[PDB]
Design a protein around this ligand. Structure first.
Ligand code: FEG
Ligand code: FEG
Ligand code: FEG
Ligand code: FEG
Ligand code: FEG
Ligand code: FE
Ligand code: FE
Ligand code: FE
Ligand code: FE
Ligand code: FE
Ligand code: FE
Ligand code: FE
Ligand code: FE
Ligand code: FE
Ligand code: FE
Ligand code: FE
Lengths: 344, 344, 344, 344, 344
């Protein structure tokens, strides 16, 4: 298998957030005995995992920055980073963040400059600035691009060079639907077998040097492609989730808390209805559909900031008690406390 | 099992059509050795099949007509009808149609009058005019009502008397969606297990005294209820089809020919794409979706009578040839002949 | 009239398909006594037809490739191609395909390289690499561009240089709706007469060197512009079809077979209903709308590959027979055979 | 031709409005020399016109009120009403209104009581309380029913007694779409020619005893039926309008003023664009669509009462002047005055 | 405050229209005693107003044209332009238009060439060709770009250089919704405070050198940002309007006349209903919604050019009279005259 990584990333925004570390990269470095992995970031971490843990034989990284100001900070010893991450990463992260922040004051932003600590060539990756050459014969094209509306112009330079059947993954900067539309080939004048590509995601939560795990979007790749990528992700990232593409946004670090609350509510309510009340799941679903749709419509109509002046949180208290049994009895206590505090 | 048939039917429109006979009723009469079944019609045929072939122990028929002018024509011997249907039903059907047509000139229409040839009491059915009493303890309520907008007022008289879990079937005079809405119980003030009913269909093609077979709508009954009814229908009607409720209309005697052509086209096209061209089914589906949606939208925009002045049938000929292989090669010959004759 | 062709095309994918030839180009070459037309392809064939058969006085072809590796293969004599196409094109096409395939191994793809056999300058066309200069004073701008999402950036370089009222046509790589949006001028601050353009298509089936005919999209150009282009296409391509723009995709070589089957079904069903049954076309249309919409919705809900496990093909057989008369009786035989073979 | 009028009407709400008279009924009375027509109202006026001016040979009026308290006020001489309506109807209308108002204090509302001044039997109409018998053999069924949600139960008693092809008209108390749904016969089990009815309207503006004219809804009857009814209406009501059914509501006495303003604006704007600016009508239409849709959406979003706090009327003044030429220059003066007075 | 103007504009289309002048620029020149303002145009006028009347301390103009053929016409004395605009601008505008038209024959269009009369550096503005440097530290980014589909590629070069919270305004060449989508940042992997921008408009009617006033789109910026911009616009442009973004198009110089007519109708009808009839505004709104929606749907269904053959203008006359009172009585006279002339 040949992996082509399109976009090496820059550390600057990771450092600037103040809240990331190298825990996962350090774990992988120790697993495979290659200390330089410990300070990889972004797609370089993910490529090193795929190469060293999942048997991906050939890795190329393409990014225009390699002909510009690709900057490798060498101030930090890999073994010191590994050691700090064994107990408290914040022993060393403040020094790293301060150095990166200083470099980023004058170093241009990508693709003119990028900040790394391990050169990808030292991981056995090929490097290039030519996306067309990187994707040649690639089985897995891992794209890591800026914001979605810039992606068609980037991709259309190399789309016709992609190997038929290749797995192509998108960054969270674009919805899967829109990324797929770049590749979708519909109508034609010559009846030849289409060069179908398998569009999906290989998207980490947080930043991949910090956390394992990976999210694989379903809906736009074959089952075989999803299974292949899921198994790679299990080996390389430590765990993987395959999920409908339309749920990627809702499970990101900004949104997931709300999706999680709502989902826990749906599942708990469903189980109270079917397991204790004894009604069909379809009954739970009909009630849930109307409840979810109407609370969502209220938010959109009046604004999330004005919901309480339209629906007093206290209005729910008396009637919500009626379903306080079974699975829902685990979650309602906290909900009642919250709504009691917020009632008019 | 108790079956409550709500609506006995009238033969008059069957006779008036000029195109029906008693072939199936005669077949069942011979199978079970009860000649009087041979001239049943409508729900009475279906009830006799369920009782005599599918083990339904108790049958009641409710219809207001039993207190009005329920008319049993006795001019025809069951054995003569059976004998005629062994080779040519039209030996006897013209005499039957003429008699029914004459009776129908003065006999009021249902529910004031109804024309039968076998009294249901002679089949071992209970008869009543009270729908509320008929449905008491019934496991299968087979409704056979006039046009859909009259059904809520009829049903609401007995809906609260129905046994929880009962299977309730609707006539083709109402869509399943609308029939279900009569029964749907949504919101409530007391958390008790809902008295869920299993809404479906048991609908024959043509008229049931003429043809076996039955259509069972999916979407609004439990899987167990659909399976129960499907197995009853196999035994009682000789065959059964379970299908999404929304397809009932499209498979009726007025519509099915078009649905059949379109479906045969979809399946043939799909198979050419996947089996010969080697593309994924999803590719066939994306093309089919746009093709079907746009040809449908054209019809709606300009009228079915004006399609050819907008899309010349000849416009399709050259390009349609490009997919002339595999399964599609069986159906395209006739299609090309048709479009060639219709081209501008 | 001045025609500006934007995009000369490359033969490589035509050769690679294994299924095209020069039949139409050869026919035109013989009609006008210019053998070099016989090995034109793509827009060059169409331009030669317009110039030599439809009186278009001035033709310019613009393509960046003219300053890059525009490659004219001279291995094949025009008269040998013409002679072979009189009886069996496959006497010579394999040699041509093999040569093109070999050249295409190393020649860059367009716009860096392109494969032709007749230089457009030898047809009396002006050549340029500047789209802005090509479109100056052009009455007909025939665009032949890659995939639709690349077209705005190409077109916006020259859109303000187009002559008011010009006819502008798009390749099948973009839907007419989306191409039109590039040109649509809505709001403004100075009330001056808009420089309205006439957006349509001039799109051949298959490849134009192989087959005559042309498809002209309606909906986004004046009636006068459509009529002008239709008459040019009749003369230049031998026949023409004008059709709603939204039907272009559905009539392409990949899709047309399905559209053709469905359309033949609609027309046949309509005619049985109106001509034999004697009902209004509106009755046929109401049934057809529901049938088409529901069979399409089923496909989308369960997948084209799973339709039969939801709607048994055999379910249609009994009821479809009821409309077996009139025009529908020509098409139903094949349909019944297909559904009988596929029934559960 | 046989006309069946279903609903005789009651005068009480006409009198109570304080604003109606018998001008049209008096005109018809004088035209045909039958003074008793002068104090007909509602459908009785329209039936008398159809019989006496349009050759309708047979008229029956059905209404339950004929077996209840059908009340004919005889206090007023027809010739005195005719004479007053020659110059000032308000010489006599106050006396009539006061008498009707007094009678209506104790007389039950229809169908238990109804107030007339001319018994329909004295116009040569048959009277009945049985709708089923009235519609027998009727070519034109003029329904005049209360509010739409009561109409299915009324109509379903007689729908199966209607002559195939009959013209059936609805009161303004129901939209044509909903009335049509009562009659629409879709699916069926026996392929016989449907008994298609021609659903339309014959609806007067104001009250028909006061004003001539009639509105005939298009969309749900054959062209022949609409033409027949239009020609009857021209003769009987003095003028007629045929219009899309969906525009009936918008042209009623409550709504028409707004529809008229908007329509005059659309037509004036269109003509300025095409005739003076010289742009295609499609350009005017694209601008008008967005303008109409967005002003409508604003009203719905903020409420008709809050539009000005969102869109200052003065915001339109400067830019609207730019189209002040041609047809629009006739209507803009008043509009500018209005918006100037309303500006913030 | 730092204002970055992205796009200096070109006068050529203003001159070519034949209908603009420098009235507002001259007024501002006289107000602040800087004659060179009198022949500014486009964003330069607006920048000079903001600097000289609204206290904006720092103005930079970025445009690629400054490194190409930025052309300052010096044939006209500022004081002569000011003097002419005191009484009749057409004393001098024809000479200006002719000169500009001649220059524009050979000068390339922007961004290769642009026509001005006052160099922005002579107004105290910084000039640059680098948008990224112009937006650095800018509080108000006034963009003035060509057609919307070119804007993402322009903006994405500098979007990450914008100061958090900056106000960013768009030209009328793009809808606010689409411009906002360029900037919208949705999902993310690191929970840091988003760098929210305040997207709105600062759009003049006509051309800003001719007319004061400005339109500020609501919906995509904070209330504080809208208020800030509204107050700047009041001072700098002389008046300002804040309105829902979706109404910008409808109030442009091409569309406003129709929007104005319709809005005046809505307000007049509403007031007749509430103030004279005494009904709730919600009653007026329900009627208006149906009227507006249906007249709009008719236009779309049949075409703006075919409305009268479907809805006779005369059909409205009789019923529209019924609401002829109150506010509507001011506007109906003209409407009735128009519809009377147009009736069939
Ligand atoms: C900071 C950051 C991050 O955490 N996550 C993601 C993706 C995700 O979470 O799904 C991205 C894109 C990112 O931004 P970053 O700037 O680190 O990476 C973008 C990369 O994208 C590269 N790039 C820009 N244009 C091109 C191009 O035309 N081709 C290629 N191959 N790389 C390109 C840049 O130089 C840069 O290395
Ligand atoms: C002729 C005919 C037919 O072939 N198929 C169907 C149904 C289908 O194909 O799905 C119907 C309804 C039908 O009409 P028919 O008039 O034969 O049957 C309607 C029956 O419905 C009965 N009925 C009317 N009102 C009531 C009521 O309130 N309760 C009951 N139980 N039956 C009622 C009538 O008296 C009559 O016997
Ligand atoms: C092979 C092929 C084909 O059969 N049909 C179509 C259109 C259709 O069926 O509707 C296209 C576009 C095509 O692709 P091909 O690569 O042959 O043609 C695209 C042409 O488009 C040219 N091109 C690319 N960028 C530009 C540009 O900016 N301007 C112009 N004028 N041509 C351009 C290319 O160099 C090339 O000659
Ligand atoms: C006052 C009034 C009016 O001006 N316009 C309309 C219609 C329109 O403008 O389109 C109606 C219905 C009306 O109400 P009105 O009460 O005058 O008329 C309703 C009539 O409808 C009759 N009616 C009620 N139920 C039935 C029924 O079952 N059958 C028949 N035939 N008439 C019925 C009533 O007794 C009454 O005579
Ligand atoms: C004539 C004209 C006008 O009246 N109004 C508007 C806007 C509105 O009414 O809302 C525009 C855009 C216009 O077109 P004009 O050609 O005058 O202005 C476009 C400007 O936009 C500049 N431009 C083009 N590309 C870029 C770019 O990448 N960056 C910047 N800063 N300016 C650019 C051009 O050189 C030019 O000066
Ligand atoms: Fe991400
Ligand atoms: Fe998210
Ligand atoms: Fe049926
Ligand atoms: Fe049907
Ligand atoms: Fe681009
Ligand atoms: Fe094509
Ligand atoms: Fe297609
Ligand atoms: Fe009315
Ligand atoms: Fe109305
Ligand atoms: Fe503008
Ligand atoms: Fe506009």
């Amino acid at each position: 298998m040949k992996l082509a990584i399109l976009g090496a990333g820059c550390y600057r925004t990771h450092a600037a957030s103040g809240i990331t570390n190298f825990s996962r990269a350090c774990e992988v470095a120790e697993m495979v005995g290659k200390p330089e992995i410990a300070m990889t970031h972004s797609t370089i971490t993910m490529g090193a995992e795929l190469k060293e843990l999942a048997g991906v034989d050939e890795v190329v990284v393409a990014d225009p920055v390699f002909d510009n100001q690709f900057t490798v900070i060498d101030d930090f010893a890999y073994e010191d980073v590994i050691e700090a991450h064994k107990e408290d990463p914040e022993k060393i992260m403040p020094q790293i963040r301060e150095k990166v922040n200083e470099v980023a004051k004058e170093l241009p932003k990508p693709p003119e400059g990028a900040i790394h600590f391990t050169h990808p060539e030292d991981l056995g990756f090929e490097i290039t600035t030519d996306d067309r050459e990187a994707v040649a014969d690639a089985d897995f094209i891992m794209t890591w691009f800026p914001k979605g509306d810039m992606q068609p112009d980037i991709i259309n330079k190399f789309i016709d060079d992609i190997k038929p059947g290749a797995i192509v993954t998108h960054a969270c900067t674009i919805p899967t639907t829109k990324f797929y539309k770049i590749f979708e080939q519909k109508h034609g004048d010559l009846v030849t077998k289409p060069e179908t590509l398998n569009v999906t995601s290989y998207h980490p939560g947080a930043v991949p040097e910090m956390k394992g795990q990976v999210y694989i979007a379903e809906g736009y790749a074959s089952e075989d492609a999803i299974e292949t990528l899921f198994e790679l992700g299990q080996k390389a990232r430590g765990n993987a989730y395959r999920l409908p593409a339309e749920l990627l946004g809702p499970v990101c670090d900004m949104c997931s808390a709300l999706t999680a609350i709502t989902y826990a509510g749906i599942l708990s309510y469903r189980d109270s209805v079917t397991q204790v009340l004894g009604a069909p799941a379809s009954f739970a679903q009909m009630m849930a559909k109307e409840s979810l749709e109407q609370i969502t419509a209220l938010m959109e109509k009046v604004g999330i900031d004005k919901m309480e002046e339209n629906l007093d949180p206290g209005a729910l208290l008396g009637t919500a008690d009626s379903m306080n049994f079974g699975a829902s009895a685990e979650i309602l206590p906290t909900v009642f406390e919250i709504l009691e505090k917020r009632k008019k």
